[PDB]
Amino acid sequence: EMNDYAQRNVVPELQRIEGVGQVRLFGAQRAMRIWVDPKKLQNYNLSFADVGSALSAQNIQISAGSIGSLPAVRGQTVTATVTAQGQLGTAEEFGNVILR
Amino acid sequence: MAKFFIDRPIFAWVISIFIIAAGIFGIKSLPVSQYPSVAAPTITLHAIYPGASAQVMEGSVLSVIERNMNGVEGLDYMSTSADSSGSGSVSLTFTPDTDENLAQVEVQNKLSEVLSTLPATVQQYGVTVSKARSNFLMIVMLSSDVQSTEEMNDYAQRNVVPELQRIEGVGQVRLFGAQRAMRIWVDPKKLQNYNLSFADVGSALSAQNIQISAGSIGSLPAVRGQTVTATVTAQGQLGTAEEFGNVILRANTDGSNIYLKDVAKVGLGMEDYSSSTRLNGVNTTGMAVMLSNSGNAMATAKAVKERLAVLEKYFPQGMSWKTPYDTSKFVEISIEKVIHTLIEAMVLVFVVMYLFLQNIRYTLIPTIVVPISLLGGFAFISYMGMSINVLTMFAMILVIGIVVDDAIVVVENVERIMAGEGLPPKEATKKAMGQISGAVIGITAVLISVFVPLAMFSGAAGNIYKQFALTMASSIAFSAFLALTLTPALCATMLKTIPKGHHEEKKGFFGWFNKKFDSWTHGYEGRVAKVLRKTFRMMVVYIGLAVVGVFLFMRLPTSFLPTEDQGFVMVSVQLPAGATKERTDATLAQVTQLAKSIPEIENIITVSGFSFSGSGQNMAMGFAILKDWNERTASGSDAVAVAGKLTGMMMGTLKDGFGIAVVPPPILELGNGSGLSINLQDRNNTGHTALLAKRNELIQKMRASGLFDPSTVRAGGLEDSPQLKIDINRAAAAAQGVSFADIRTALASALSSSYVSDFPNQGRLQRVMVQADGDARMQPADILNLTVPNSSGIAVPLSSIATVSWQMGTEQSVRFNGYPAMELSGSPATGVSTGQAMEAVQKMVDELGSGYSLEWGGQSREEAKGGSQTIALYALAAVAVFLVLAALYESWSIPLAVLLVMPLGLAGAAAGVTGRNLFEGLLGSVPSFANDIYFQVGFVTVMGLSAKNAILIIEFAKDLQAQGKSAVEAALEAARLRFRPIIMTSFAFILGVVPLYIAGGASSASQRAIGTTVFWGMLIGTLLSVFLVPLFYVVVRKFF
Amino acid sequence: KMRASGLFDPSTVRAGGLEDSPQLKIDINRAAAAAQGVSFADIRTALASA
Amino acid sequence: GASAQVMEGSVLSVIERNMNGVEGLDYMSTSADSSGSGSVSLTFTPDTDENLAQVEVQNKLSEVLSTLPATVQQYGVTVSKARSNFLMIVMLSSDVQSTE
Amino acid sequence: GYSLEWGGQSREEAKGGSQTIALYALAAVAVFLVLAALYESWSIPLAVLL
C-alpha cells in the first residue's frame, strides 16, 4: 500500500525538481497477479494461452460513440453520449472470468 | 573629451557618419512584428480518438501521457483537457529562459515510447507535438456561394496552400476544415438481411484496397548471360468511388457476389463534419497565415495579397478571396505616428529656438543631433537581438524630449556665454563644456542607473519592460555621446560672433518679447527670494504635498495593460446540453441578423462547433469585425459600446441559449481580467460528485461568506449532460451464447466510425472511413445483438443484457499536475488586494478534509510571488543614483538635496490621473486608467527629467559658492540663470505631448495613458522644482 | 545548342539524371478475377513473394 | 511499391512544402527514384551552426508525420548531417579467402 | 517559365559578382573617413583616392 501510494503521489511530485534525474523506487506499484495451478489445467484440458485469450477478450474498453452524431438528418434535437464500462477493476470480478 | 572634440570637427563628423551607417544597417536587418516574445514555451499535443467520451479518452491516453512527462529540464506545470467530441489536449507549460525546440523534441522523444502502449486507434491518426506560442499575420477567407465547404477546402489545399507558404516570411499556414475522404455510408438493414457485418467489410476494404510491390526483373544475384533489367509496376489500389462500389465482400457458389454499391453508399465527403465557418451567411473556408521569427510583416502581407491577386486571376466562377482581419496594418500606423511626432517635434523645437535664441543658425544643431541618436538607438536594438513592434515605437516616442533636452541646454549655455561675455564661439563653447561636462556625465549616469533595473524583472512584465529599458537607456547614452562630441563642434564652427551692444538691442516684434521675458524672470526671481526666507513653512507644505501624493498613489487601482480597440469583438454562443447543430446554426443566423443591424460592424465570422471554453455540438463563436477608424470617430463607436449593444440585443432577441459579447483584451498570456483562478484538485481520487460538492461548497463560501463580487463568481468549466449508459450483465451472457468482443465491435461499428485504409485522390492520399447509416442511429433504442460463436445466432437483442437507462454524466475532464481539477474564478471586487484573498481561499481549502488541494494557474502564478522585486530594486536604484551624485558633487549632503524631487513626479502624475478619472467619470464612461505599465514608465521618464533639471540647478548653484557667495545668493543666481532653458524644454515637451494627450484611433488608450501621465508629471514637476530646488539646497547647506 | 559552340568542348556535356528505361506494366482485371474466382490477396502475395 | 511520381508527390512534397519557415535555409533539392527511396537535401546559410538547424528540422518534420502513409512511419525518416565528398578509401586485400 | 539555377561553386561565383564594386566602394569610403579623421582635412583624402 505504501509502495502504491509512493508511485502515485510521492514519485511524480519530487521528480519535477530542476536537478533530479532519476527516482528509483525500491519496490513495485500495484498490479493484478493471477497465480495459476498447472495441475488443474490438465483436468479441464486448458492452457495458459486460453487464460490469456479470455483475459484479453473480456477485459477491454468499450467505446460505443454517441446518439445523433454531427452528420445528422434535418430534425434531430437530442444528442446523448453512450458510455459503456465493460471493464474489470476488482478481484471478485476477475474471479468470474469465463474460460469455457 | 569635450576639450578634444571641439578643435577637431571632422573627427566627430566621421563618428556621426559611422553611427548613421550602423543605424541604417540595423534598420535594414530588424524583424517587424506587433508583439514580442512574451510567452513561455508551451507544448500542445492534440490527440485524436473518435467515438469516445471524456472519461474513456482520459483514462485511455491522458493518464498514460501525463505520467511520463516528468523529468524534462525546465517544466513548470502541466494540464490535460478532454471532452465528449473525441479530441484531447495536453498543455505542458515550461519555465522561462528555456529553449522551446529542445523541449518540443523532448516531448516528442517521450511520446515515441509512450506511443508503444497506446491503443491502435490513436496510432492511425497519430499524436503530434506542437507549440502553442505562434505568430499571427493574416486571415484569408474564400467565398463562392455555388460550391460546398469540402470543394473549396480541396481547392485551397491544392492551389492556395502550396503557393502561400513558399514566399519569404510566411512560417506556417494552418487550414480550418477537414480534408476530403471516401465515406462509405453502410446500411445495417442490408447487412442483417444478407447476413453480413462490419468486420468483413473492413477486412475487404483493407484487403482489396492495397499497394503491391512486385520488384524488378533481373536482380543483382543474376546468372551468366543476362543483359536486360526492367522493373515491374503493379497498381492495384482504388482511387475512384465507382471502383470502390465494386468491392467484393463475399463470393457465392453460383455467382452474383455482394458489392459495396447495393448494401452501402460510397461517396466523397469530409472527415468529421464537426466545424463550419461562415462569413455573412455564405460558405467560407479558413487559413491562418502565421509569421516566422526574424522576418518582416509589412512586405509579407503585400506579397500575400499579390499572390492572392495572381490566384484570383485564375479563380473559377464564384470564388473570391477576402481578408477581413490583418495585423500587418497595426504597425504602419505606429511608424507613421513616430514619423509624425518626430516632424512635429522638429517643428516645435525650430519655433522655440527661433523665438528664444533669435537666430536661425542655432536651430540647425538639434536637427542633426537627434536622428543620429535615433539611429544609434536602432543599432543598439539590432545588436541585442530585439525587433520592431508597438512597445519599441512607443519608447522611441517617449524618448523624444530627452534627446532634445541635452541639445537645448548645451546651446543655451553657449548662447548665454556669447551674449554675456561677447567671446568668440570657440572659447565660449570651451567654457560651457568645462562647466557642464561633468553635469551631463552625472545626468547620463543617473539615467542609466534608473533605466537598468527596469530590465531586471521576471515574467511577462519583465519582457515588456526590457524593450523600454534597452531602447531608452541606449538612446540616452547615444544622445549623451553626441552632445559630448559632435555638438561642441557644431557650436564652434557653425555659429557667428555676437556683436556687443547692437545684438540684444532689438527693434520689432522680439524686443517686446525680450522685455516681457526679462520682466517675467525678474518676477520669478522675486518670488524665489520671497520663498527662500520662510524655509520652515515651505518645508512642511512640501512634506504635506509629499504625503498626500503618496496617499493619492496608494489609492489607485492596479493593472498591467489597459484594454483597447482592435477592430473586432469576440462573441460566444452557448446552447444548453443536448442540442444539435441545427439549433446552433439557427441561433448563429439570428446572431448574424442582429449584427447586420449595427452600422459599426463591417463583417462577421461565424464558427459553429468550436469555442475557447470547450468544443461541442452546442458551442459556437463569432468575430464581429468593425470598420476603419476614420468613419468610427464618435462616442458610441468603440468596441466596448458595440459589445454592450450586442449584449443588449442578444438578451432581447436570442431566445434559444445565451450569448455574451465581450471585447478581446491585450496579449492572452497576460490575463488581465482573470481575477483569481482556483484549481481544486483531489489527492485520494474519490470521484466526480464529491469534487463537484466541494466546488459548490467553495462557491457558496466565496459567495455568502466572501467579498469576491458574488454576482460574477461561478464554475468556469462545463456542466453535466444526460447520457445513455448501459450495464452488460455477464451472468446472462455466460449462461447463453453471448460473448464479449461481439458487443464491442457492434457498438463501435454502429455508434462510431472506423478508419480502414487510404486511397490516392489525384496525387495525394486521403482516408477511407465507414460510418454505416446516419438515419438508423437517431433513437436511443439500439437492437443489434448478434454473433453467437458457432453460427449467425439471432436469439435476443440488447434489451435484457444491456439494460439501457439514462444517467447524468460529465462531458469534460480537466486534470492538473496528474490530479483532476475544477476551474474557478475570483474577483478583487472593492479595493481589496489579492494578497489577502489568496490567504482567504487557502484557509477555505485548508479547512476541508485531507485530500483536497489547490493550484493557482495562469496570471495568478506571478501574483503568488512576494513583493520583493519592485521595492528592493527601486531602493537599489535610488541608492545607486545617490552614490552617483555623491561621486559627482564630491559631498554627501547635496545628493540628499537632489533626491527630494523624486516624490514630486509621483504626486503630480497621481493627481493628474485622479483628475482625469474624476473628469471622465462625470462626463463619460467608467475610468479606465490605473497603475499599469504605461503610468509607471511615464513616472520613470518624468522622474529622470526632473532629476536632470535638479542636477543642472544644483551644479549651477555649487560652482557659484566658491567665488565668495552664500547659499541663498548662489541659489538665486542659479535660478536666474536656469529659468530660461527649463521653461524652454518644458514648453517643448508639453507642446510635443499635446497631440499625445488627445490622441484617438488605433491603440489610442496606451497613447492617452502615456500622454496624460508625462503631461501632468512634467507640469507639476517643473512648477514645483523651480520653486523648491533652491529651497532644498538652502535647507541642506545650513542643516548639515 | 550548348555543344559545338566553341565554349563547351564535346563528349563531356551530359545530363545529370537517370534516363528512362522500359518497365513492366501489370493491369489487373477485377471482372475476370470475380468471374473466375480468385481474390486480390493471392495475386498480391504472388507478386510480393515471387 | 511506388514509382517516381507518387513517392515524390505524397512523401517528399509535404516535407518540402512544410520545411519552409526555418531560418538560414537557402535552397531545397528533393530526389526520388523508381525503387521507392527519397532524399531531401536541405542547404542552409554559412556562418550558422548545425546544432539549432538539426533540431528545427526534426521539429518541422514531426508535424507532417501523421499525414504520411503508414509504411514510411515504420521505417522512419533517417537524419544524416554528413558530407558528400570522400576523405579516405581503405582497401582490404587477401588471397586466402573470398570478399564476403 | 523555363528558369535556370546553379549549384555548388557556380552559386558562389554568381553571388560574388556584385560584391566586388561594393567592396571597393566600402574600402574607398573607409580610407576616406579614416584619413579625414586623422589629418583633419577634407581635401587631404581626396588626393589619396586618385
Author numbering:
A (entry chain A): 151 to 250
B (entry chain B): 1 to 1040
C (entry chain C): 701 to 750
D (entry chain C): 51 to 150
E (entry chain C): 851 to 900
Question: What does the original paper state about this entry?
Answer:
In N. gonorrhoeae, the best characterized and most clinically important multidrug efflux system that mediates multidrug resistance (MDR) is the multiple transferrable resistance (Mtr)CDE tripartite efflux pump. MtrD works in conjunction with the MtrC periplasmic membrane fusion protein and MtrE outer membrane channel to actively export antimicrobials out of bacterial cells. The cryo-EM structure of MtrDCR103 revealed that this multidrug efflux pump adopts the overall fold of hydrophobe-amphiphile efflux (HAE)-RND-type proteins and forms a homotrimer. Each protomer contains 12 transmembrane helices (TM1 to TM12) and a large periplasmic domain, which can be divided into six subdomains (PN1, PN2, PC1, PC2, DN, and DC).
The reconstituted sample led to a cryo-EM map at a nominal resolution of 3.02 Å, allowing us to obtain a structural model of this pump. Interestingly, the cryo-EM structure of MtrDCR103 indicates that this multidrug efflux pump forms an asymmetric trimer of which the three protomers are distinct and display different conformational states. Unexpectedly, an extra density was found within the distal drug-binding site of the binding protomer of MtrDCR103, indicating that our structure of MtrDCR103 is bound by a fortuitous ligand. The shape of this extra density is compatible with a hydrolyzed, decarboxylated ampicillin (Amp) antibiotic with its four-member β-lactam ring open. This is not surprising, as we supplemented with 100 μg/ml ampicillin in Luria-Bertani (LB) broth to grow E. coli BL21(DE3)ΔacrB/pET15bΩmtrDCR103 cells for overproducing the MtrDCR103 protein. Within 4.5 Å of this bound deactivated Amp, there are five hydrophobic residues, including F136, I139, F176, V607, and F610, which provide hydrophobic interaction at this distal site to stabilize substrate binding. In addition, N135, S275, and T277 are involved and perform an electrostatic interaction to anchor this inactive drug. Interestingly, a positively charged residue R174 is found within the vicinity of this Amp binding site.
